[PDB]
Amino acid sequence: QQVGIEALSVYGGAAQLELRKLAQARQLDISRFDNLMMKEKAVSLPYEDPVSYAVNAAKPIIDRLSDADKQRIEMVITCSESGIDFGKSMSTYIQEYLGLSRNCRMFELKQASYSGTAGLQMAINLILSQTFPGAKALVIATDISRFLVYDWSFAEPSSGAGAVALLVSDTPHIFQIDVGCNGYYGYEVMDTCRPNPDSEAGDADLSLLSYLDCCENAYRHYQNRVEGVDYRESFDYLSFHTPFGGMVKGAHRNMMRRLKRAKPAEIEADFQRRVMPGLVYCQQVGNIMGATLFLSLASTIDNGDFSTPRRIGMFSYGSGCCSEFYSGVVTPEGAAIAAQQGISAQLADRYSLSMEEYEQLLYHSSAVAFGTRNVTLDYQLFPGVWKKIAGKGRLVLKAIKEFHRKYEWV
C-alpha cells in the first residue's frame, strides 16, 4: 500500500528581519547568531494571521488540482500553536477560502511543534484505513509569533512565522512514506509553553536537553521496530524540527557519537552532507513551529542530490513534550516536481525590515491580539511592504467584525 505526500507548498511570509540587525541593536557580536546558524526570521504583519498564512501555503496545491481531485479532499487538518479561538478550528476558514467541499472533516490539532507530524500521521492513517478509497487529506501546519510589547524575550531571535501545506494521498508524488516505520516518545515537561495568548514562556536550556533526550529515544523506538536500520547507512538525508540550526548540529553530533562512535571531523562531514541541506530554508524563516520539519523536508529536497531515489529520516519534536522519528523516500521525479515550486525565489522576494520597522510592527501587533472583537486593518501601515504583496494573489486579513475574521485576495 502506497501513501505519502502528493504535493507540498510553502509560505514563508511577506517580510523578514536579518538577525545581524537584531544583534547590532542589542550590541551583541554579529557572530553570536552566525554561531547558532541563524540568518533571518520571517515576521507576520498585522494584516496576516495563521489562516492567511495557511491559505497562501495551500493555494498553489489547490490551483493545480482538477475539480474532481479537489472534491476528493475530505479532511482538512490545521496544525498550529497559534490558534484564534478556543473552539473554532482554522480549518473552517481555510475550507471557505480555498473553495473545498462541504463533505469534509475539519479540525485543528495541537501539541506544540509536534502538531504537523501528528496531522501528517493522521492523514496517512486515513489513506491506509481504506475507509474511503480515493479520498485525499489536506494537512497545513501554520504558525506565527505574535508577541506583544517579557516571558517571550528568550525566544525573540528564533520565533518566526510560516506555513507548509501537504496534500496526502495514495499517489505520493513527492514523499513516499515508509509505512509502520515510526518511533515516538513523550512525557510531561515544562520546557516551553504558551500559557497566555500572544506570548511564550520557557526554559530554553531545559528544552534543548529535552529535545536531545527525545531525539535519542524516538529513534531507538524506530530502531526497535525497523530491524537492521543504521543511523548513517539507512538515511541519505536527515531533517529535523529546527528551532535554530546550531541545536540541530548539536543533536546530530550527539546521535553520531552515541550510535556510531564517530570522530569529530567525520561527524562534521556527515553533518554537511546529510543535514545542512535541510537547514537552508529554515535559516531564512526561523522557528516556524509545527511547520519547521516540513520546511526542512522541502529544503532537503531542493538543496540535496536526488539523481537516484533517496531515503530521508525525519525527527519531529514539540515542547511539552512529544516527538516522533519516521522516514520516507523521494525520487528524482518528485524532486523535479518540488523544484518547480520556486521556494528559494519566494523567500528572496520578501521585504527586508529595518530594526525601526520591526519595533513598530511589534507595537502595531496589539491591534490584532487574541480576543479582538472588531478591527479594521490599515494595509498602508508600511507602504513598502504593501508594494511587495499587492498584485501577487495573496490572502490577507482585512478585518475582524464581531469576532468574524474576513480575508481579502490582494
Partner: protein, 78 residues
C-alpha cells in the same frame, strides 16, 4: 564522587569548550551564561560531564542549575 571533584570536571570541559577561559579563575557562583557560553555549548558541557562520569540518565535531570556550583550539586546527587 564529591561535589568538589565534580566541579573540577565541569571546569575542565568548560575551559575545553571555551579556550579563552583557560587561565581565568572559575567560582562556584559563576554561571555558564554570564561566562558566556552559548545555548548549544551549555548543553555540550552537561553531556561531556555525564559521559565522563558514565551517568546514563535523562539529560533533563541536569537542568535548572543557576551556576556551576549548583550544577556540581545536581551531578553529585546522582
Amino acid at each position: 564522587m564529591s561535589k568538589e571533584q565534580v566541579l573540577k570536571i565541569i571546569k575542565k570541559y568548560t575551559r575545553e569548550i571555551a579556550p579563552e577561559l583557560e587561565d581565568s579563575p572559575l567560582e562556584p557562583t559563576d554561571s555558564l551564561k554570564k561566562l558566556g557560553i552559548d545555548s548549544v555549548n551549555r548543553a555540550e558541557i552537561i553531556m561531556m560531564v555525564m559521559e565522563d562520569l558514565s551517568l546514563n540518565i535523562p539529560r533533563i535531570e541536569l537542568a535548572g542549575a543557576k551556576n556551576i556550583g549548583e550544577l556540581a550539586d545536581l551531578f553529585a546527587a546522582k
